[PDB]
Amino acid sequence: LSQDFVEALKAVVGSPHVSTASAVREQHGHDESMHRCQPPDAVVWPQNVDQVSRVASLCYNQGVPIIPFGTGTGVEGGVCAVQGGVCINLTHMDQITELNTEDFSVVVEPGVTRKALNTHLRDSGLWFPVDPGADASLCGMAATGASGTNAVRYGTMRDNVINLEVVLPDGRLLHTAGRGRHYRKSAAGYNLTGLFVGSEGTLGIITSTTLRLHPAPEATVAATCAFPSVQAAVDSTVQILQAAVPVARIEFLDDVMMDACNRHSLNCPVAPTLFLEFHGSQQTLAEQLQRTEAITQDNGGSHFSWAAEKRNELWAARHNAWYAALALSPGSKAYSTDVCVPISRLPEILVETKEEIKASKLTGAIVGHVGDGNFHCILLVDPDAEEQRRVKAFAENLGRRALALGGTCTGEHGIGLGKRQLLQEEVGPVGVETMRQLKNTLDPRGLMNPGKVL
Ligand SMILES: Cc1cc2nc3c(=O)[nH]c(=O)nc-3n(C[C@H](O)[C@H](O)[C@H](O)COP(=O)(O)OP(=O)(O)OC[C@H]3O[C@@H](n4cnc5c(N)ncnc54)[C@H](O)[C@@H]3O)c2cc1C
Ligand SMILES: CC[C@H](C)C(=O)C(=O)O
Ligand SMILES: [Mn+2]
């Protein structure tokens, strides 16, 4: 990367906000995945959208790859600079604006985390529900198409992103639904917002997200329920969903995950467990609990172990399940699977996955959003090239089993570097060419986070 180019970057954002230092680049060359660190040639912190546009235009016209960087909590190598280039850390743009409580909407810049937003909204009676375990950038969550434990009731990022401000690869500024617009529904033209949700930084740089806010629940009850087997817990899950109980949260942990979480945080019985949460009025809760306890009882579930601070403890342990797993073998890294299948096929694949983890030398824990037909296998890897090949082969086989059942290889994490072949199988030749034609019209030179997704 030439000295003239670095000085041009410094001319846009200021000398303090450009770094070519080795350690700074290394810190921005990886996320939380096992994908090997690949340092960008420089890291740049734009201070406003004009600077984002001018950095993008400078890189694009000079043939320099651009890697958008939020909080670096992704798990598929999205920020890995496989072709070098300029990593654009967006987190100094950290303002909440256009809070419209009467309309249930707000605009956030990339440095705003869900934590920061919900802190800002305390006493408003509103909250933002999409809750990945990590303290992630909300714009990063829009970029990956994130979901979380609350999604079964309150929707994913795709459900809750109403508008996006995007700096396109050559620097042009796009407001996907129109500048300043926010509304409940539209048929006006082609929906551009949904194209950029889940684009992972390969179609442009998200510099603000307009989010749907939700009313805080009238009352909240959380509980855990222990089961004799994986089959019993997942059958209960499917039957709760088919009974249309509007559960707020329904999270599965197998016995391995439960023990890991116990050890890293809880003293739940070591068993396949559902973490449950219900929202409503006092009477609406009693109805929901009654119908849900009946279904769990039919499948051998324990009487509910009930959970303010205790509920926060419960969900904090769930949100840290990734780190609880890693702690089973210190020094190791991890790869998460993320398949999502038609709910009626969830019992087969989860039970089969549990059986396949037992039959192998791999250490794996199972956790996730079974209310969506989605789950994660957290596979530990010693950074033992043979173990890492066995983990990667396990992940691909599980992905292909999900595709065989009519499902998808990723419910929320994305494709990044890890699932590019699975995506080709998932949508076929015409799906791939169509996605690539979309990529090519927005990023003709292929400089917008190259090597990812497609
Ligand atoms: C402990 C833990 C728990 C997690 N739990 C969940 C979970 O429940 N659900 C879930 O969906 N994910 C989960 N994640 C994954 C991760 O938190 C999400 O994928 C999150 O959305 C990533 O945001 P980020 O800004 O940290 O991403 P980064 O790693 O910074 O970037 C991710 C990708 O998006 C691109 N990108 C980032 N910001 C922008 C932007 N502003 N514009 C354009 N492209 C951008 C990057 O180029 C990259 O390809 C978890 C991660 C951890 C470590
Ligand atoms: C980082 C992957 C993790 C297992 C996750 O997505 C979750 O906590 O639901
Ligand atoms: Mn998850």
UniProtKB/Swiss-Prot annotation:
Residues 36-216 form the FAD-binding PCMH-type domain. Pfam families: FAD-oxidase_C, FAD_binding_4. GO terms for molecular function: D-lactate dehydrogenase (cytochrome) activity; D-lactate dehydrogenase activity; FAD binding. Readily detected in liver and kidney, with a weaker signal observed in heart, skeletal muscle, stomach, brain, and lung. Its cofactor is FAD. Keywords: Acetylation, FAD, Flavoprotein, Mitochondrion, Oxidoreductase, Transit peptide. It is an enzyme of class 1 (oxidoreductase). The modification N6-acetyllysine is found at residues 10, 392, 419. It catalyses: (R)-lactate + 2 Fe(III)-[cytochrome c] = 2 Fe(II)-[cytochrome c] + pyruvate + 2 H(+). It is found in: Mitochondrion. Its EC number is 1.1.2.4. GO terms for biological process: ATP biosynthetic process; lactate catabolic process. GO terms for cellular component: mitochondrial inner membrane; mitochondrion. The keyword Mitochondrion applies. InterPro entries: FAD-bd_oxidored_4_C (IPR004113), FAD-bd_PCMH (IPR016166), FAD-bd_PCMH-like_sf (IPR036318), FAD-bd_PCMH_sub1 (IPR016167), FAD-bd_PCMH_sub2 (IPR016169), FAD-linked_Oxase-like_C (IPR016164), Oxid_FAD_bind_N (IPR006094), Vanillyl_alc_oxidase_C-sub2 (IPR016171). Belongs to the FAD-binding oxidoreductase/transferase type 4 family. Involved in D-lactate, but not L-lactate catabolic process. PANTHER family: D-LACTATE DEHYDROGENASE (PTHR11748), D-LACTATE DEHYDROGENASE, MITOCHONDRIAL-RELATED (PTHR11748:SF111). Interacts with CSRP3. This is Probable D-lactate dehydrogenase, mitochondrial. It comes from Mus musculus.
